[PDB]
Amino acid sequence: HMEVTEEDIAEIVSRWTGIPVSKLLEGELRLEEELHKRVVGQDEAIRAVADAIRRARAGLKDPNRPIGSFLFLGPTGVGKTELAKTLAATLFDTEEAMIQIDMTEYMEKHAVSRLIGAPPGGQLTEAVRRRPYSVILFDEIEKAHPDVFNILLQILDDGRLTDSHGRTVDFRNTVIILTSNLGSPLILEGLQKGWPYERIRDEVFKVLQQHFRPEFLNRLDEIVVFRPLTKEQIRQIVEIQLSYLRARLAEKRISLELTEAAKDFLAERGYDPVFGARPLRRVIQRELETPLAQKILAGEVKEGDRVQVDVGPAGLVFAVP
């Protein structure tokens, strides 16, 4: 039977139950390759997440806990959020299924009420109430007030939270992702001041031991250390970040052919150890989109054209065969 599809039936069941389509169609796995469509490198992170999901779906884990819980260590701008968003879209149909909580906004004692509700629901509890199938991302976890930190421990331990009214909110269908870049600025400080490797490594271990206790770490499925990106990995990210632009140009049958020097130009400006690849978006906007816009408006780049992008003296240069 060809007319009614698997997706048709899943859609009806999803609307009737609240269970996401991808969740119902999970069986019809190759989750790593799917996540890799959007996340370049961080192979260890990807396998950690997929392995935990496999253990849960196979019935090997405690049913009264989240699907998975992770701490993502390592530097900023190298894929922690891209993985969380991709995971949400892949497991739960959409990126809207990622809930982000910035712990720098939860540093003071009374922030607990922002999470679970004021004393006689709050941000987190109400969010998870309407979307039980969610990836919850807590950024800079070490900055949370102890009272806030304790509420996370309840989620990990019990797979649920009681809000400030007395109602239990279910977290058994969530994935928990905690992030911290602790250690990364310290390394940069030591490399700039010229400490021997030995002192840098000792100091990193010290700050980790100060903020993260074994009793906390033991609760997690995995601790993953994200790595700085290689030059080739940054080049692959350049290509991904150009997809939308390429799609827009394709409507006018315009194509963009970047030389290797041009791709390296964007890669070199769009990434550093301090911000990771966070700068790359506005580098592409300023170095490529803007002068390309001028050419299109000037009639120099026409519908149908293949445009070669190279490195000139003043930045990128555009030529039309």
Ligand SMILES: Nc1ncnc2c1ncn2[C@@H]1O[C@H](COP(=O)(O)OP(=O)(O)CP(=O)(O)O)[C@@H](O)[C@H]1O
């Ligand atoms: N490994 C990777 N694969 C694909 N894209 C990546 C990537 N690392 C970084 N990027 C791109 O660079 C940007 C920053 O990455 P991401 O947001 O994952 O880092 P982050 O979550 O550590 C920043 P913050 O610490 O500010 O939250 C994203 O838009 C992302 O698309």
Ligand SMILES: [Mg+2]
């Ligand atoms: Mg992030």
